């Protein structure tokens, strides 16, 4: 009974795209609630039989890196907050506290002595200290991939289950810069019942508050039935700090932040300090505070009110615990004893609030509206839209994607076996998962941390990449060596990884050359891994020390190969040009690897004395005035030269691409016969305002539409081969490359913004597609959501996250741009797509970072560009809020995010080598993925357990006849299965014991987790 995710438009009370269309966005002065109105209430609403029940929820926002590193904050702040929370909660049984960031809690609790560990477990068990969400971090929701949101959630909740014996079912997300429906998607499939959000556009807060729609059942945009719905509370005011959480008037609420009276170095900007509560003022102070509470309660439907009490790195000093607790206790004693207030107020936790709300709902006091959509792009005031962090620090945004994939591949490759503890597999994988998880923080992948904190994140992720490489190569050596020969040294490097696209050429000269020669080594084994659960072919390239190399498979069948030069681009400070130079001793060999589902395939590279029969050589043409020679050592084809001119290329049966004389795409012809469809790449620059608010790491505040980059007469390099052709051009700040391998082209930009201050570089595509004001962008790599460009909003409000792809279409034609990294983008006119490449900003943007963005470094951004005819596709109706990829665009996204992995055998001879692993793995239908495969038990467990997360996307149906494929039952991928269970996505709760030990496949747009148990 799968739900149809295409043809049924859900009926919801609030659909955010519709709301955006019909809503005004005027920024009017609301009074003391600057972005609201003067709230009025009827005092007679609450009375003896209907009291307002107020939960004051103490909290402390602890960033795992931002202006200090994780460890710096831990030593200077968080270890003291947690130590003093333990003490003060222990000593004050009615006090409560909620905690979100498990990275810090795990760091603290492991350093506690046993007596204090037991004390901590007691205040958790008795409900005083409550974990909210329980992720390793409170992640960004814009740039993060859903796989990594799940990874970090699982890392924190697995720790909490093991050590605290609790699993949160309420989420707390007070700080990400805008909010995504991927979160309720994952949380509802992970046992959650409630979630809270805060950072939404001030106009949205006003609109929803006017309708009492700040609490809603948030379902996915395609979900007609509502089974994805998760109850969500949106906070109504500008901040999560105490001045903006007691009620609408911050001048009043600041007087109830008792850390602000002076000795703590804090004050109230509204110039009225807090006063210590005493018997002689408690009636007056109570009157003021209850009036704020009753105004806040007017914005919600039940008689249960949430009052967060906290701020960043609060509840540190013992004196701060005392000043907040004793003054609130005095207020509660007075309020609760004076019947005319008709209030019962107490410290509470987040789960206590939600339980009481749903008790009111069950009592028939409220029904809640249904909502679908997202909450991007956030603006906290005026025109200050937070679309800059969709691009800031793009090197690390790209690195997140790379590490995402190597964590998946390392956990999958090593899951096939149990490993002795001496192999350190679990240690290395825990490290890798935790450093990637930490980077999902809303100051990590967002690019909003101080320079030295970004360096810490990068160093952590490099150690995680090294850890993944170690696990992967030990696993390949085990999976492909004859078992009676296998003799591992768990510290040795049997293989090294070769990655063509990270850090990427012009980024790092990291790539090892395979050194062959008659007097040293005639041949070398290489192995490709395919983490996807279907057979896959992909071209792979390696560097080799001779152009005379041929490829075989380990049945010694020849494999067709192409050798090309190794070209690198140089900014020549003497000629003031950007031009390529070729190596005269290293060459690139390219061939198609064919790899089993979730498997491995071995090939052999062999040198010979002359051109091998099954190896061809690319031609090379350098277009520039005033050329000079380009010798290439032993490469058998001389480079050709010419003046800049338009050129066209076609690889295989694929599209024909035409290029301008500046080396930029101008048109795509899909078929021999079909038209040249205009598709024009252009690079432009945005600047910064010379008056008013400045762009910085968070905010994008351009000084008008983008201006074209002046290109001069750039040098263009055309490489034409049977298997791979490309056009590369050295533009100012970007070496731009279009690569052809017979299908949709690959685009690579090596982006070096240099010392161009106050500049944002954008890549735009111009077409004739009649898209109007509509375009589609993805959310967290999970779903594509319809966007409408609104001219009532400024340019920066029409920018959205592009975490993995975007497209425009009309009745007949679609252009989809898939990315290998999250960046910001838009469609600012009909027929256009654009995506920001990097941004260098001299000023701070007044959101707390205290610096601009002047730490840029070269980054290789990767893309696929898919032009398609879509007039025969069955698409959603015009009212539906979602869009869906085609098969080719989905495969192109997978080619960027989860390419084949390439391993080079490190020693001269691999004794016992095998040619393949996984040839009998099922090759599953193209829309299904094994997103996670993770062994959950160490080797001493009698019953081994392996967890799998399956995800099925939804691809549009455009008339291509379906292949028979094989069903994938993950529970029988390993032998001796004894039990198969469906679980929450974190693997922490069993939901169903499955018949026959068979894990069913999932429906389109669904994600399920299974755990197989094996006797061992
Ligand atoms: C010191 O200058 C003030 O800085 C404020 C930002 O610092 C405060 O918040 C940070 C937030 O840290 C979290 O959020 C960041 C992203 O911002 C994130 O990266 C972190 O992970 C973390 O989660 C916090 O660390 C720090 O302790 C501090 O609390 C900023 O909000 C202030 O702007 C207000 O005040 C300005 C005058 O001082 C004023 O010009 C601004 O317009 C803005 O005024 C507010 O405007 C709204 C809407 O009109 C009103 O409703 C508010 O009442 C009003 N507030 C005030 C005080 O007037 C400021 O820049
Ligand atoms: Zn934060």
UniProtKB/Swiss-Prot annotation:
Keywords: Disulfide bond, Glycosidase, Golgi apparatus, Hydrolase, Membrane, Metal-binding, Signal-anchor, Transmembrane, Transmembrane helix, Zinc. InterPro entries: AManII_C, Gal_mutarotase_sf_dom, Glyco_hydro/deAcase_b/a-brl, Glyco_hydro_38_C, Glyco_hydro_38_cen, Glyco_hydro_38_cen_sf, Glyco_hydro_38_N, Glyco_hydro_38_N_sf. It catalyses: N(4)-{beta-D-GlcNAc-(1->2)-alpha-D-Man-(1->3)-[alpha-D-Man-(1->3)-[alpha-D-Man-(1->6)]-alpha-D-Man-(1->6)]-beta-D-Man-(1->4)-beta-D-GlcNAc-(1->4)-beta-D-GlcNAc}-L-asparaginyl-[protein] + 2 H2O = 2 alpha-D-mannopyranose + an N(4)-{beta-D-GlcNAc-(1->2)-alpha-D-Man-(1->3)-[alpha-D-Man-(1->6)]-beta-D-Man-(1->4)-beta-D-GlcNAc-(1->4)-beta-D-GlcNAc}-L-asparaginyl-[protein]. It is a single-pass type II membrane protein. Pathway: Protein modification; protein glycosylation. Induction: Inhibited by swainsonine and by copper sulfate. It comes from the Eukaryota. This is Alpha-mannosidase 2.
């Amino acid at each position: 009974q799968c739900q149809d995710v295409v043809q049924d438009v859900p009926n919801v009370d609030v659909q955010m795209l519709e709301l955006y269309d019909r809503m005004s966005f005027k920024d009017i002065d609301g009074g003391v609630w600057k972005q609201g109105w003067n709230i009025k209430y009827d005092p007679l609403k609450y009375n003896a039989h209907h009291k307002l029940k107020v939960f004051v929820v103490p909290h402390s926002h602890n960033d795992p890196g931002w202006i200090q590193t994780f460890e710096e904050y831990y030593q200077h702040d968080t270890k003291h907050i947690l130590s003093n929370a333990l003490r003060h909660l222990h000593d004050n049984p009615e006090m409560k506290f909620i905690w979100a960031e498990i990275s810090y809690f795990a760091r603290f609790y492991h350093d506690l002595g046993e007596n204090k560990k037991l004390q901590m477990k007691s205040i958790v068990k008795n409900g005083q200290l409550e974990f909210v969400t329980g992720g390793w971090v409170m992640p960004d929701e814009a740039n993060s991939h859903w796989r990594n949101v799940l990874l970090q959630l699982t890392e924190g909740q697995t720790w909490l289950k093991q050590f605290m014996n609790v699993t949160p079912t309420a989420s707390w997300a007070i700080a990400p810069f805008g909010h995504s429906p991927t979160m309720p998607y994952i949380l509802q499939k992970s046992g959650f019942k409630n979630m809270l959000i805060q950072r939404t556009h001030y106009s949205v807060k006003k609109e929803l508050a006017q309708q009492r729609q700040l609490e809603f059942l948030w379902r996915q945009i395609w979900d007609n039935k509502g089974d994805t719905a998760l109850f969500t509370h949106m906070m109504p005011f500008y901040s999560y700090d105490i001045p903006h959480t007691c009620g609408p008037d911050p001048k009043v609420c600041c007087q109830f932040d008792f850390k602000r009276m002076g000795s703590f170095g804090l004050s109230c900007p509204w110039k009225v300090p807090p006063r210590t509560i005493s018997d002689q003022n408690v009636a007056a102070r109570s009157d003021l505070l209850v009036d704020q509470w009753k105004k806040k309660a007017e914005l919600y439907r039940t008689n249960v009110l949430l009052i967060p009490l906290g701020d960043d790195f609060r509840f540190k000093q013992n004196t701060e615990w005392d000043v907040q607790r004793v003054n609130y206790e005095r207020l509660f004693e007075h309020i609760n004893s004076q019947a005319h207030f008709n209030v019962q107020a107490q410290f509470g936790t987040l789960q206590e609030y939600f339980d009481a709300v749903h008790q009111a709902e069950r009592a028939g006091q409220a029904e809640f509206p249904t909502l679908s959509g997202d909450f991007f792009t956030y603006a906290d005031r005026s025109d200050n839209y937070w679309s800059g962090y969709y691009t800031s620090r793009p090197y690390h945004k790209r690195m997140d994607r790379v590490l995402m994939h190597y964590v998946r591949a390392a956990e999958m490759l090593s899951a096939w076996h149990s490993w002795d503890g001496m192999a350190r597999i679990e240690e290395r994988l825990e490290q890798a998962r935790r450093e990637l998880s930490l980077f999902q923080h809303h100051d990590g992948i967002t690019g909003t941390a101080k320079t030295h904190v970004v360096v810490d994140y990068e160093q952590r992720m490099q150690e995680a990449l090294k850890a993944c490489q170690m696990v992967m190569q030990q696993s390949v050596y085990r999976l492909l060596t004859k078992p009676s020969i296998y003799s591992p040294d768990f510290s040795f490097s049997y293989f090294t990884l070769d990655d063509s696209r990270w850090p990427g050429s012009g980024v790092e000269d990291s790539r090892t050359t395979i050194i062959l020669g008659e007097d040293i080594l005639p041949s070398k084994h290489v192995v490709m891994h395919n983490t996807l659960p279907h057979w896959r072919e992909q071209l792979v390239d390696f560097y080799v020390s001779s152009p005379f190399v041929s490829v075989t498979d380990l049945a010694n069948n020849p494999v067709e190969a192409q050798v090309s030069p190794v070209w690198s681009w140089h900014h020549d400070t003497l000629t003031k040009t950007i031009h390529p130079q070729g190596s005269t001793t290293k060459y690139r060999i390219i061939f198609k690897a064919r790899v089993p589902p979730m498997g491995l395939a071995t090939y052999v590279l062999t040198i010979s004395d002359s051109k091998p029969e099954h190896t061809s050589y690319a031609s090379n043409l350098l277009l520039r005035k005033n050329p000079t020679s380009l010798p290439l050592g032993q490469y058998p084809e001389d480079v050709k030269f010419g003046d800049p001119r338009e050129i066209s290329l076609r690889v295989g049966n694929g599209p024909t691409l035409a290029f301008s004389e500046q080396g930029l795409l101008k048109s795509i012809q899909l078929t021999q016969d079909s038209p040249h469809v205009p598709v024009h790449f252009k690079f432009l620059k945005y600047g910064v305002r010379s008056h008013g608010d400045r762009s910085g790491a968070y905010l994008f505040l351009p000084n008008g539409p983008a201006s074209p980059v002046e290109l001069g007469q750039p040098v263009v390099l055309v490489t034409k081969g049977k298997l791979e052709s490309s056009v590369s051009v050295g533009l100012p700040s970007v070496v731009h490359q279009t690569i052809m391998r017979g299908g949709a082209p690959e685009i690579r930009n090596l982006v070096d913004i240099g010392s161009l201050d106050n500049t944002e570089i954008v890549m735009r595509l111009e077409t004739h597609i009649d898209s109007g004001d509509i375009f589609y962008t993805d959310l967290n790599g999970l779903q594509f959501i319809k966007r409408r460009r609104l001219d009532k909003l400024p340019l920066q409000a029409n920018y959205y996250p592009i975490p993995s792809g975007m497209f425009i279409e009309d009745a007949n034609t679609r252009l989809t741009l898939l990315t290998g990294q999250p960046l910001g983008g838009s469609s600012l006119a009909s027929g256009e797509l654009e995506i920001m490449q990097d941004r260098r900003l001299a000023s701070d943007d007044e959101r707390g970072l205290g610096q601009g963005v002047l730490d840029n470094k070269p980054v290789l951004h990767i893309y696929r560009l898919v032009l398609e005819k879509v007039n025969n596709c069955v698409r959603p109706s015009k009212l539906h809020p979602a869009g869906y990829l085609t098969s080719a665009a989905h495969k192109a996204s997978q080619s960027l995010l989860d390419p084949l992995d390439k391993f080079i055998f490190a020693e001269n001879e691999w004794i016992g080598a095998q040619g393949q692993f996984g040839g009998d793995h099922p090759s599953a239908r193209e829309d299904l993925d094994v997103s996670v495969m993770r062994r959950l038990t160490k080797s001493s467990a009698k019953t081994q357990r392996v967890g799998y997360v399956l995800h099925r996307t939804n691809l549009m149906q455009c008339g291509t006849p379906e292949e028979h494929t094989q069903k994938l039952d993950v529970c029988h991928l390993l032998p001796n299965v004894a039990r198969c269970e469906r679980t929450t996505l974190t693997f922490l709760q069993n939901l169903e014991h499955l018949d026959g030990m068979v894990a069913p496949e999932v429906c389109p747009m669904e994600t399920a987790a299974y755990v197989s148990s094996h006797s061992s």
